[PDB]
Write a protein that binds this ligand. Structure first.
Ligand SMILES: Nc1ncnc2c1ncn2[C@@H]1O[C@H](COP(=O)(O)OP(=O)(O)OP(O)(O)=S)[C@@H](O)[C@H]1O
Ligand SMILES: [Mg+2]
Lengths: 327, 70
């Protein structure tokens, strides 16, 4: 599916009603000067989708704010809406009809938008962590992306008690197989992706019998060099290693779109080029990239642009769009 | 600094007319350039030197001047 557009109502810095159309762009860059409101725009996307990484949203010189997302599910265009009242009460709607967060989560969870793992949203300043996180954390994420985290509770309950053991092996077999169903795929596609962004990278399970109970050691070796511990990589190197992991992990159950804030902040002009190349080379109707960049090197190669600017009198962010597929 | 070169071409044209289309301003400079100019406007609008308005999705961007442009 595709994120066709958004509609914000007193969202953050977006006073009044704002419409954002992505058109048929499968590579859109949200550009604009510092403080104009680009990240608020991502905050709006993460908001409609659920995601908890409240009244502090709602514009401030109204009593409630809402965001709508127009998702393209096959022939039909689905409208996903979410509201916040000043008291904190949220409400979800689908095609206008109110629904529960469970029904909401599932709709999304079915289109491969796991607001649980958040593995499709890289917020400003967070890109390097995807690589630099600890093996325990990386493991936790795998457990989170595969879904193996569910059996985490029960597995713990039955784990402590010690015929009650068959109920433990039975569940262990699920947490483990579900965990591997994702890890194995990611591992197999990791090196190709890292090399394209360049090179050599790999993942390594520590507790082989119960991988979910230990770290996952991520190793990346930029080209002309030779080391492996993320400790040695530089900022730009760590960024590229991170974007590779990020893409590898998403390769299993592909989200329909990515929303990357300033992922290129620490990059070379050469590296910005490789990321842009990769994005362009892989973007398509099924994989849409929404990127927030301050670098021309990055947004030049976009299909379209969502320009954000301030209108000081009105104290609000504003939007204008441009289609670069023509120039 | 191109945000000045763009401010110039606009400061001129907006003294010979009330409205100015983005596509036109680009025109008077001859894709990496379209995006470059696009940012320049956004920057200028934020500083308060210019006014922006668009009617439809990817329609025309009307640029009007503000006292500060001068
Ligand atoms: N509830 C709110 N009401 C009105 N304005 C807000 C609100 N929350 C944030 N802002 C404004 O939005 C700005 C932050 O916008 P962002 O989306 O972070 O801009 P940005 O374009 O991402 O800037 P960078 O990250 O520096 S490139 C702040 O300067 C605030 O003045
Ligand atoms: Mg920001």
């Amino acid at each position: 599916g595709r994120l066709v557009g958004l509609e914000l109502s007193n969202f953050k810095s977006y006073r009044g009603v704002t419409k954002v159309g992505f058109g048929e762009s499968n590579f859109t860059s949200i550009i604009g000067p510092n403080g104009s409101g680009k990240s608020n725009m991502m905050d709006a996307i993460s908001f409609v989708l659920g995601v908890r990484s409240l009244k502090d949203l709602i514009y401030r010189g109204p009593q409630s704010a809402y965001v709508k997302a127009f998702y393209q599910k096959g022939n039909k265009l689905v409208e996903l809406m979410r509201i916040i009242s000043r008291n904190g009460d949220t409400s979800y709607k689908i095609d206008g009809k109110t629904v529960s967060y469970k029904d909401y989560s599932i709709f999304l969870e079915n289109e491969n938008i796991l607001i649980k793992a958040k593995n499709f949203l890289v917020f400003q300043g967070d890109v390097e962590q995807i690589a630099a996180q600890s093996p325990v954390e990386l493991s936790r994420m795998f457990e989170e992306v595969s879904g193996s985290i569910q059996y985490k509770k029960e597995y713990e309950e039955l784990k402590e008690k010690i015929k009650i053991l068959n109920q433990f092996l039975k569940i262990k077999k699920k947490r483990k197989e579900l965990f591997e169903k994702t890890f194995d795929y990611v591992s197999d596609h990791l090196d190709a992706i890292y090399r394209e962004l360049t090179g050599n990278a790999s993942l390594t399970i520590e507790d082989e019998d119960e991988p979910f109970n230990a770290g996952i050691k991520y190793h990346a070796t930029p080209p002309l060099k030779r080391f492996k511990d993320m400790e040695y990589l530089s900022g730009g190197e760590k960024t590229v290693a991170a974007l590779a992991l990020l893409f590898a992990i998403n390769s299993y159950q592909p989200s329909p779109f990515f929303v990357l804030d300033e992922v290129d902040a620490a990059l070379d002009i050469t590296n910005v080029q490789r990321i842009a190349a990769y994005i362009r080379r892989h973007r398509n109707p099924d994989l849409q990239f929404i990127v927030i960049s301050l670098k021309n090197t990055m947004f030049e190669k976009s299909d379209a642009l969502v320009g954000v600017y301030r209108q000081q009198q009105e104290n609000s962010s504003k939007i204008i769009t441009l289609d670069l597929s023509n120039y | 600094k191109a945000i000045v070169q763009m401010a110039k071409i606009l400061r001129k044209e907006l003294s010979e007319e009330k409205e100015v289309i983005f596509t036109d301003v680009l025109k008077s400079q001859a894709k990496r350039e379209a995006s470059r100019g696009f940012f320049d406007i956004l920057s200028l609008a934020t500083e308060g030197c210019i006014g922006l308005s668009q009617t439809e999705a990817f329609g025309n961007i009307k640029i009007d001047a503000k006292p500060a442009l001068f």
